[PDB]
Amino acid sequence: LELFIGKMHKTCFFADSDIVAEEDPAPCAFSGNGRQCTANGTECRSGWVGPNGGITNFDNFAFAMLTVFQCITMEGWTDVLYWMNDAMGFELPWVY
Amino acid sequence: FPSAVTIKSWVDKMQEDLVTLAKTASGVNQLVDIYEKYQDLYTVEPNNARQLVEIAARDIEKLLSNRSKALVRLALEAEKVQAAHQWREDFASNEVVYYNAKDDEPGSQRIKPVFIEDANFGRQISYQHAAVHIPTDIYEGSTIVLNELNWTSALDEVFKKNREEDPSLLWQVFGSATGLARYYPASPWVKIDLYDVRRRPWYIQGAASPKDMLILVDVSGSVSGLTLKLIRTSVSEMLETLSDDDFVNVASFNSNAQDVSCFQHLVQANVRNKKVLKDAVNNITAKGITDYKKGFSFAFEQLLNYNVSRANCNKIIMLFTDGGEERAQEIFNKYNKDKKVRVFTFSVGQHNYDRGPIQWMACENKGYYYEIPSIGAIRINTQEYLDVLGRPMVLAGDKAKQVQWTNVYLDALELGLVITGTLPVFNITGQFENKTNLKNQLILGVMGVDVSLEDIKRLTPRFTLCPNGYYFAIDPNGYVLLHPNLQPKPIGVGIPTINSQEPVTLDFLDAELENDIKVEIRNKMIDGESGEKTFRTLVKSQDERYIDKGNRTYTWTPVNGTDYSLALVLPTYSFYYIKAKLEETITQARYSETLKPDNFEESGYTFIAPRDYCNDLKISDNNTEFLLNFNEFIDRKTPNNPSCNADLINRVLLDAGFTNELVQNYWSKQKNIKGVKARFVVTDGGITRVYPKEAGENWQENPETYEDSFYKRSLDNDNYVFTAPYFNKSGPGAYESGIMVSKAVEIYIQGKLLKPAVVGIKIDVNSWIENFTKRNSDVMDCVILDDGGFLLMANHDDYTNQIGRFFGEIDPSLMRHLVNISVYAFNKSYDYQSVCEPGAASKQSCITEQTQYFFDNDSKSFSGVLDCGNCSRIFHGEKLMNTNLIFIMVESKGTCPCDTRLLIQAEQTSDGPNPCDMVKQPRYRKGPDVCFDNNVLEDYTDCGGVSG
Amino acid sequence: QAVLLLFRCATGEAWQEIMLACLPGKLCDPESDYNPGEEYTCGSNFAI
Amino acid sequence: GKFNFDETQTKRSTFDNFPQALLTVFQILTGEDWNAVMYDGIMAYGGP
Ligand SMILES: *[C@@H]1O[C@H](CO)[C@@H](O[C@@H]2O[C@H](CO)[C@@H](O[C@@H]3O[C@H](CO)[C@@H](O[C@@H]4O[C@H](CO)[C@@H](O)[C@H](O)[C@H]4NC(C)=O)[C@H](O)[C@H]3NC(C)=O)[C@H](O)[C@H]2NC(C)=O)[C@H](O)[C@H]1NC(C)=O
Ligand SMILES: *[C@@H]1O[C@H](CO)[C@@H](O[C@@H]2O[C@H](CO)[C@@H](O[C@@H]3O[C@H](CO)[C@@H](O)[C@H](O)[C@H]3NC(C)=O)[C@H](O)[C@H]2NC(C)=O)[C@H](O)[C@H]1NC(C)=O
Ligand SMILES: *[C@@H]1O[C@H](CO)[C@@H](O[C@@H]2O[C@H](CO)[C@@H](O)[C@H](O)[C@H]2NC(C)=O)[C@H](O)[C@H]1NC(C)=O
Ligand SMILES: *[C@@H]1O[C@H](CO)[C@@H](O[C@@H]2O[C@H](CO)[C@@H](O)[C@H](O)[C@H]2NC(C)=O)[C@H](O)[C@H]1NC(C)=O
Ligand SMILES: *[C@@H]1O[C@H](CO)[C@@H](O[C@@H]2O[C@H](CO)[C@@H](O)[C@H](O)[C@H]2NC(C)=O)[C@H](O)[C@H]1NC(C)=O
Ligand SMILES: *[C@@H]1O[C@H](CO)[C@@H](O)[C@H](O)[C@H]1NC(C)=O
Ligand SMILES: [Ca+2]
Ligand SMILES: [Ca+2]
Known part of the structure; x- marks a missing residue:
């Protein structure tokens, strides 16, 4: 909650449209440190739902508790780690 | 406020000034004398309506007899060649060589053609062979395709033989039931390609007779999810296989049966009605339990209505379910014990239900069973039901072989508006002994030949009659x-x-x-019977802004071979035309110099109608090179003109002398007039002369005489017609062009009224302003309006700046009251072929509503008081004589601070008329009298269940 | 990154998918040194 | 029957009939892709 709050909400969008530019979207850089759009005519802004339709994120105590439990159960923790790697840099999320 | 008698003094003084200036400057009486002074360079010939229609109806009948012979020739060879086929299974060494379209190989060898550029074809073609189109979903090089691609190679010999007899022949296409279409001449195909020859309107109309389709949709709970949107897409693709001769309705059942739309019965399934069903079927939701007994009872009862118009042909029920455990034996036994209705069942989606009852409901009801597990199977499975419906047609044999002509549609290969003749091809292998009879119940394909609407337009010439007359054919x-x-x-x-x-x-x-009379004429024309009627009609102008009433004569006759009916609309003052009679050289030659661009100063800038004078001389649609290509042609080609028609060449050349005589003998005398900015004259021959060489450019009019809105408007009216300039800087027309006035000349040669040409001037708006005042008064407003409520002259500066604008957009309170007091009438229409900017939920086609205003009462004096609330406004209106102008006087808009919503006369993007209440009283129509269903010899022993 | 991948495999997340992705017929990154023309050489049957 | 919300695909680990529910429960017990079934169940009741 203290670290990864409200950061999974920036995906590669299209130029002046509300259409996601990826079939399997991933978050962009929250502050220019993570992943940036590479396609020529794509930009990413806020307003995205989330990686798993909003289920998996750290922007609430219930959401954070659920995703922490899921990561503890060895199932799908690398997905959350890679989404963190897309949102922020590579150095902080791997420690967590 | 001035008295009524005082206003008449104002109007009479200005009416005399306007008419005298228009009469003297244009030279209406001088050109009338010029036409009547000779009476020997031309002859007056009658325009017999009865002969004109019958001659043109025989040309159209003969033209469609050309194509019927080609179809019969093509169908005879296709059946004979395919009957002598051995069904080879290997194509390794005996490779099949053909030219596949849309290209930059197990047993296929490609062909590289030359593709010369040919006229009467908007693209490169090749007469050396025929092209083959194979849809993307269909793999070329399979056993089915290659066998179909080998025996069809003999169609090329007939393709070339057909063109030899008739060089003016368009696409000839063989649409195989396999999927590939082989057409002649070869031409490269036109994003991705979704063209399937089996979904084309001409193929579907020949694969089976009309139908009475009734779609049953399962909207029970079990279909929610992927299999619901699969059904919605499946139904939408199924509606694409219907035409205007087929009647359809859609119903849904979930423990209760109901219609998904507003129709409540079978409807004609045209473009408007199919859109309603498509929109309604996309709004359905899945909820409830399944009741097949209540669903089929609803469907069977809707096929026994007979209250309304139907097809009286194939009666089919298409059930869109997934699976079930109910067979409804009693319903089928009760309703169709004699099996007079087919039932086609579709199992849609990835499910684990029972398909047994679904399969049984098709075999026992002379139907077929189809499976649609995903989106990729929707397009192919929604067109295969025409194989079952074609069984009674193939068993009929020779009697079920007639050429059918489709509706007007745009050609896929970018050729324009065309129609196609259709003839099915049967599989007759073993028919000489009648032993197989198993796969011989399906058609091989459909043979088609295209006829362009330009070909039909050549058989109905219009240049021997006035621009207000025209031909039109009906279906x-x-x-x-x-x-x-x-x-x-x-x-x-x-x-x-x-x-x-x-x-x-x-x-x-x-x-x-x-109109009320038009409905009676249309009904008589549809069933087929000759007739004639003369009646008064209100006619819209070329620019959808004016309406004028004029007598018209309708003469219609039916075409013999086909079911079409041809009619010719011909007003009065046009039963006689001018046929030029001159063959001498020096008299003809001196008229040819008048056209020389150089003398555009002495003769005034000259335009030439881009008509098809001779074959080699091609139109250019600019009137700069075409004029150059004309005088050069007339000074280079011998007068014999072996291939060039002289009726048009004599018509235009005769008017060149007639028109220049007005310019030189009369217009040159008055070099400059204070109130005249330009002088023009337009003639039936097709030449327009504007004296101020300069003015020539300001001429924003069509060089073709028969498409000039002001020309036809001046023919109907028997006085001076004022045309308001277009608003919003639609070219230079505000102050550098002026108000256009026109007046058609009337000629009495031997007691026959003739209107060969129109004349007029362009009034200088600045000069008219000075005469109007003899200004910016805050007490009263003085405006002049024309027939249509367009502003032409005011005295408030800001009003004058917006010249040629609808008065309802600048003073809605006054204009709305005028319509109510019955001085301005109006009739509203719908423009279906219009394009508009899309709105919120490029440009797309849409329906627009057009409104046009015209004078209703014949009285010339109008006075009254306008009550806008908490105030009072008094007005007086007088109409000028021998013109379409009305002068009205009213006080300022600021005296009463009221401003209602502005009245709009413009292209409004509407959606009417409502189709939910047009099916209650549909227009009269006649359906085909041939039907092919319920044949005794039909097998119907195979469905999709036994094989599946 | 190799240690992280091995930790992922030890936890057993998609190790068979990684093995499939390490098969011989795989594209080579431009920064590697390889002869022109043979772009798809990296990856080996040793992955299984 | 509540796993028909996606409308773009068909789901294999559902609770449609008894054998399918039994297989889904066994798969969850094995622990493989149990979070996917949890996400489907959550989205079947209104999502996050
Ligand atoms: C017009 O009608 C005639 C018959 O009235 C029709 O000619 C018949 O065409 C069929 C093919 O559609 C031939 O069928 C033979 O028998 C089977 C049927 O497919 C084939 O054997 C395998 O069958 C499987 C499917 O069951 C298939 O997947 C496979 O490819 C087939 N071949 C194999 C395994 O090698 C035979 O190969 C096939 N051909 C033979 C035996 O030569 C009939 O034999 C044809 N009958 C006659 C009298 O010619 C003709 O196609 C119809 N015209 C058109 C345009 O369809
Ligand atoms: C379906 O494909 C078949 C295989 O290509 C075609 O059959 C071949 O047609 C050729 C053209 O006539 C034949 O060549 C000559 O045939 C005559 C007739 O008997 C004979 O003189 C010789 O057989 C031959 N002449 C030579 C080789 O100088 C082939 O014999 C014939 N059969 C093969 C190639 O196996 C069919 O024509 C084709 N169907 C259609 C409608 O085009
Ligand atoms: C039209 O169809 C109806 C049933 O759909 C037929 O039944 C009659 O309907 C009209 C009023 O709709 C009434 O005469 C009776 O209610 C019905 N029975 C009879 C015996 O008339 C009707 O016969 C059909 N034809 C007409 C002209 O209505
Ligand atoms: C279509 O065919 C009918 C006859 O089937 C033609 O009717 C002819 O009418 C003229 C009078 O206008 C008679 O003199 C002929 O004797 C009629 N024909 C026959 C065979 O009796 C009709 O003219 C044909 N349509 C056209 C446009 O010619
Ligand atoms: C076009 O002209 C006018 C439009 O203003 C309409 O015709 C009149 O309609 C009213 C409606 O009750 C009748 O009372 C008049 O008798 C009509 N005038 C006639 C018949 O001359 C109508 O919209 C159009 N007229 C048509 C279609 O005939
Ligand atoms: C085709 O039509 C023309 C006129 O349209 C006619 O003269 C001719 O006889 C018809 N048939 C052939 C084979 O040209
Ligand atoms: Ca059901
Ligand atoms: Ca796992």
Whole structure:
């Protein structure tokens, strides 16, 4: 909650449209440190739902508790780690 | 306020000034004398309506007899060649060589053609061989395709033989039931390609007779999810296989049966009705339990209505379910014990239900069973039901072989508006002994030949008659095969709200303004019977801004071979025309120099109608090189003109002398007039002369005489006609062009009224302003309006700046009251072939509503008081004599601070008329009298269940 | 990154998918040194 | 029957009939892709 709050909400969008530019979207850089759009005519802004339709994120105590439990159960923790790697840099999320 | 008698003094003084200036400057009486002074360079010939229609009806009948012979020749060879086929299974060494379209090989060898450039074809073609189109979903090089691709190679010999007899022959296409279409001449195919020859309107109309389809949709709970949107897409693709001769309705059942739309019975399934069903079927939701007994009872009862118009042909029920455990034996036994209705069942989606009852309901009801597990199977499985419906047609044999002509549609290969003749091809292998009879119950394909609407337009010439007259042909459904108002654009539906595969089916009543008499004429024309009627009609102008009433004569006759009916609209003052009679050289030559661009100063800037004078001389649509290509041609080609028609060449050359005589003998005397900015004259021959060489450029008019709105407007009216300039900087027309006035000349040669040409001037608006005042008064407003409520002259500066604008957009309170007091009438129409900017939920086709205003009462004096609330406004209106102008006087808008919503006379993107209440009283129509269903020898022993 | 991948495999997340992705017929990154023309050489049957 | 919300695909680990529910429960017990079934169950009741 203290670290990864409200950061999974920036995906590669299209130029002046509300259409996601990826079939399997991933978050962009929250502050220019993570992943940036590479396609020529794509930009990413806020307003995205989330990686798993909003289920998996750290922007609430219930959401954070659920995703922490899921990561503890060895199932799908690398997905959350890679989404963190897309949102922020590579150095902080791997420690967590 | 001035008295009524005082206003008449104001109007009479200004009316005399306007008429005298228009009469003297244009030279109406001088050109009339010029036409009557010779009376020997030309002859007056009658325009017999009865002979003109019958001669043109025989030309169209003979033209369609050309194509019927080609279809019979093509169908005879295709059946004979295929009957002698051995079904080879290996194509390794005996490779099949053919030219596949849309290209930059197990047993296929490609062909590289030359592709010369040919006229009467908007692309490169090749007469050396025939091209083959194979849809993307269909793999070329399979056993089915290669066998179909080997015996069809003998069709090329007939393809070339057909063109040898008739060089003016368009595409000849063989649409195979395999999927590939082989057409001649070879031409490269036109994003991705979704063209399937088995879904084309001409293929579907020949694969089976009309139908009475009734779609049953399962909206029970079990279909929610993927299999619901699969059904919605499946139904939408199924509606694409219907035409205007087929009647359809959609119903849904979930423990209760009901219609998904507003129709409540079978409807004609045209473009408007199919849109309603498509929109309604996309709004369905899945909920409840399944009741097959209550669903089939609803479907069977709707096929026994007989209250309304139907097809009286194939009666089919298409059930869109997934699976079930109910067979409803009693319902089928009760309703169709004699099996008079087919039942086609579709199992849609990935499910684990029981398909047993679904399979049984098809075999026991002379139907077929289809499976649609995903989106990729929707397109192929929604067109295969025409194989079952074609069984009674193939067993009929020779009697079920007639050429059918489709509706007007845009060609896929970018050729324009065309129609196609259709003839099915049967599989007759072993028919000489009648032993197989198993796969011989399906058609091989459909043979088609295209006829362009330009070909039909050549058989109905219009240059021997006035611009207000025209031909038009009708179809038994009421649609127009030929009409001036038909355009090469798809007919739109509703307003396009976004975040040419349909035919251009335009009704006769929607082509022009409707009337009570027109409905009677249309009904008589549909069933087929000669007639003639003369009556008074109100006619819209070329620019959809004016309406004028004029006597018209309708003469219609039916075409013999086909079911079309041809009619000729011909007003009065046009039963006689001018046929030029001059063959001498020096008299003809001196008229040819008048056209020389150089003398555009002495003769005044000259335009030439881009008519088809001779074959080699091609039109250019600019009137700069075409004029140069004309005098050069007339000074280089011998007068014999072996291939060039002299009737048009004599008509235009005769008017060159007639028109220049007015310019030189009369217009040159008055070099400059204070109130005249330009002088013009337009003639039936097709030459327009503007004296101020300069003015020539300001001439924003069509060089073709027969498309000038002011020309036809001046022919109907028997006085001076004022045309308001277009608003919003539509070219230079505000102050550098002026108000256009026109007046048609009237000639009495031997007691026959003739209107060969029109004359007029362009009034200088600045000079007219000074005469009008003899200004910016805050007490009263003085404006002059024309027939149509367009502002032409005011005294408030800001009013004058917006010249040629509708008065309802600048003073809605006064204009609205005028319509109520019955001085301005109006009739509203619908323009189906219009394009508009899409709105919120490029440009897309849509329907627009047009309104036009015209004088209602014949009285010339109008006075009254306007009550806008908590105030009072008094006005007086007088109409000027021998013109279409009305002068009205009213006080300022600031005296009463009221401003209602502005009245709009412009192209409004509407969506009407409502189709929910047009099916209650549909227009009269006549369906085909041939039907092929319920044959005794039909097998119907195979469905999709036994094989599946 | 190799240690992280091995930790992922030890936890057993998609190790068979990684093995499939390490098969011989795989594209080579431009920064590697390889002869022109043979772009798809990296990856080996040793992955299984 | 509540796993028909996606409308773009068909789901294999559902609770449609008894054998399918039994297989889904066994798969969850094995622990493989149990979070996917949890996400489907959550989205079947209104999502996050
Ligand atoms: C017009 O009608 C005639 C018959 O009235 C029709 O000619 C018949 O065509 C069929 C093919 O559609 C031939 O069928 C033979 O028998 C089977 C049927 O497919 C084939 O054997 C295998 O069958 C499987 C499917 O069951 C298939 O997948 C496979 O490819 C087939 N071949 C193999 C395994 O090698 C035979 O190969 C096939 N051909 C033979 C035996 O030569 C009939 O034999 C044809 N009958 C006659 C009298 O010619 C003709 O196609 C119809 N015209 C058109 C345009 O369809
Ligand atoms: C379906 O494909 C078949 C295989 O290509 C075609 O059959 C071949 O047609 C050729 C053209 O006539 C034949 O060549 C000559 O045939 C005559 C007739 O008997 C004979 O003189 C010789 O057989 C031959 N002449 C030579 C080789 O100088 C082939 O014999 C014939 N059969 C093969 C190639 O196996 C069919 O024509 C084709 N169907 C259609 C409608 O085009
Ligand atoms: C039209 O169809 C109806 C049933 O759909 C037929 O039944 C009659 O309907 C009209 C009023 O709709 C009434 O005469 C009676 O209610 C019905 N029965 C009879 C015996 O008339 C009707 O016969 C059909 N034809 C007409 C002209 O209505
Ligand atoms: C279509 O065929 C009918 C006859 O089937 C033609 O009717 C002819 O009418 C003229 C009078 O106008 C008679 O002199 C002929 O004797 C009629 N024909 C026959 C065979 O009796 C009709 O003219 C044909 N349509 C056209 C446009 O010619
Ligand atoms: C076009 O002209 C006028 C439009 O203003 C309409 O015709 C009149 O309609 C009223 C409606 O009650 C009748 O009372 C008049 O008798 C009509 N005038 C006639 C018949 O001359 C109508 O919209 C159009 N007229 C048509 C279609 O005939
Ligand atoms: C085709 O039509 C023309 C006129 O349209 C006619 O003269 C001719 O006889 C018809 N048939 C052939 C084979 O040209
Ligand atoms: Ca059900
Ligand atoms: Ca796992």
